[PDB]
Amino acid sequence: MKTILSNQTVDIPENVDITLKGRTVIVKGPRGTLRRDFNHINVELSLLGKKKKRLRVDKWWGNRKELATVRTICSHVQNMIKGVTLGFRYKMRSVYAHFPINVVIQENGSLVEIRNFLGEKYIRRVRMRPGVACSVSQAQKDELILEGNDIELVSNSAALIQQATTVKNKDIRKFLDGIYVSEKGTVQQA
Amino acid sequence: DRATWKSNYFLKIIQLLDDYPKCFIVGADNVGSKQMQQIRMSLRGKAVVLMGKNTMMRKAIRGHLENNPALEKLLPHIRGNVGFVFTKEDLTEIRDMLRANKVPAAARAGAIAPCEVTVPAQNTGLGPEKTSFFQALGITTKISRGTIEILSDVQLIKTGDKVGASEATLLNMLNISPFSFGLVIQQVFDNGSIYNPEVLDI
Amino acid sequence: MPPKFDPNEIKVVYLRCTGGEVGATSALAPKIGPLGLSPKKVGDDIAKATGDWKGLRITVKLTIQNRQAQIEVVPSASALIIKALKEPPRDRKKQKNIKHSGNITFDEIVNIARQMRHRSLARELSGTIKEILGTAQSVGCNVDGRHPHDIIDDINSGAVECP
C-alpha cells in the first residue's frame, strides 16, 4: 500500500539559520557550519516557516519503506542543530585489571596514542576525523573527551579507539579491558 | 477484570463525593505498601484514604448528575499522582497537624523551595579534614581537637535560587534535612472552598 | 554500639526458628551468638527448659540479650499454633504418616488463635482475620463437620465483641 502523504516538521531555534540548496541542507549557528546531502533519500524539503521557524520534510507517493526515512532525515537535521548550537561530547573511560592504558593526544585532536593495553608492545595509533577535537580530561582519572560538531564523525572516532582497543584469543567476559564510551552528551547543555 | 470491576470503582468514588463533604488531596510520591497499611491503622478512628488512577477525572460524572456545580474547581488538581482522604470527624487543622510524620527531608539538586536555609555555627562531627565541601564554596572552619567546626555563619541558599549538587550533598551529610513536602498534603477542599498551603491554611 | 565500640545495657533482639529438643551438633546460633558474650552450650540448654514441656514440632524463638543472659521465649506463629491446635502430639520416630495428617475443629480455638495474633495483622476486627488465618489451612480443614472452603463466604460471631 502506498501512502498518499507522510511528513514531519523540525522546530528550528532562533540561534540557527538553515538554508537548503534544493535538497542539500546547510546549517550555521554559533559553533560553526554543517552540511549534508539527502541526494538519495528523495523527499521534498520545504522551509515553510517565515522569519525562519520550520523545516518540513514531505515524502509523498511513498510506500512503507521510504515512509521510514521521513523521520530519519528529520533526525540527521535535529542532530545537526544540536551539533552546531551545543556541540557534542562523548566521554570514554579506560578500563582495567592491570596494565595501565596510557593515552596521549598528539597534534591537537587527531592522534590518540595508546601504550601498554594488556602489556602489548605495539603502540596503537588512531586518527580522528576532521573537525573532531580529542583531549585528555581532568576532574577524572582514565577518561577521554571527544568534542565535535558532527555526531557521525564524533562517534566513528569513539568507536575507532573503542575498537582499536579489543582483546584477542581470550575470554572477553573476563578480559574486560580497553577504552569505551561512558557518556554521550554535549559541550554546552542549556 | 474490567468492564464490571471498573464500573464498580465508579460507584464507590461517587459515594464518598456525596456522603463525605470534606476532601483532603494527598501527594504520595514516595511510599511503601507497608507504609500505607500503617497510616490507615494509625488514622482508623478518623479518615478514609482512597487511591485510584487517571479515572479520578470522573468528578465530571458526579457533577453531571443534573446536580453539583463547584466541583469545577476540583478540575485543575486531578493530575500528577493524587488521592483523596474523606473524613467525617474533621474539625479543621487539628487532626491535619498530627498527621505530618517523619520524611523528607530528602533534598536533591535541581530543587527550589521552602524558606531561607541556615546551618547554625555548630561543630559538625564528621571525620577529620573533610573540609573539601566547605573549601569548594567558602566558610571559615577550624580543627579544634579532632572534629570540625564552622566559626561563623550565613544563609547558604535563598528562596527561589537553585541548589547545586555539591551544596545539596554537603547539607544531607550534615544531617540538615529541608526541601520537602510530598506525602503530606497538596490542596484541601471543604464546601466549594479553595485553600492554599502558603500560609493561612490550617 | 556506636562511634567507638560502646553498648549501654544489653537489650538487643535476635530471632530464630526450628526446634527438636534444642540443637547441640557443634551448633546453635553462632555468627550473632558468639561475639555478643553469650555461648553455644549453656544458653543453648536453658533454651530447652522454656521452649519445652511441649514444643517439639518446629518453633519461632526470640532470644533477648542482657549482658550474657539469653531469654528464651516461644513467640507464637500463626501456622505453628494451627499445627498445635491439631489432634496433637505424636512427635518423632513416627510421625512417618507424615505431617499432612489433617482433621481438627478449632471452632472457637481459631478465635483464641486470632486473639493471640498479637498486633501483627494491622487488623479489621476478627471477621476478616478469622478468614485470613482460616484461609491458611492444609492440615485441619475447619470446624467438626465442615471445610474452610465455606466459612470464607460468611462468620456469625466475634465481629462486635473484639472491637
Binding site: 578500563v95 572477553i172 567476559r173 573476563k174 574486560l176 580497553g178 | - | -
Partner: protein, 52 residues
C-alpha cells in the same frame, strides 16, 4: 582491581548480549530476531553465557 561501575560499563559492551543459535552471531539484549541473512533471520536466540 576494577571498580564496579567501571566494570559494569565494559560488561554492557561485551557480556549482556543475545546470541543466534544458528549463526552464533552476537546481538543486543532486546533482540527477538537475528541480523544475519545467512541463518535466515532466525529468532532462535539465547543469552550469552555469564562468566562464573
Amino acid at each position: 582491581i576494577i571498580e564496579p561501575s567501571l566494570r559494569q560499563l565494559a560488561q554492557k559492551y561485551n557480556c549482556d548480549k543475545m546470541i543466534c543459535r544458528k549463526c552464533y552471531a552476537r546481538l543486543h539484549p532486546r533482540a527477538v530476531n537475528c541480523r544475519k541473512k545467512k541463518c535466515g533471520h532466525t529468532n532462535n536466540l539465547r543469552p550469552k553465557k555469564k562468566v562464573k
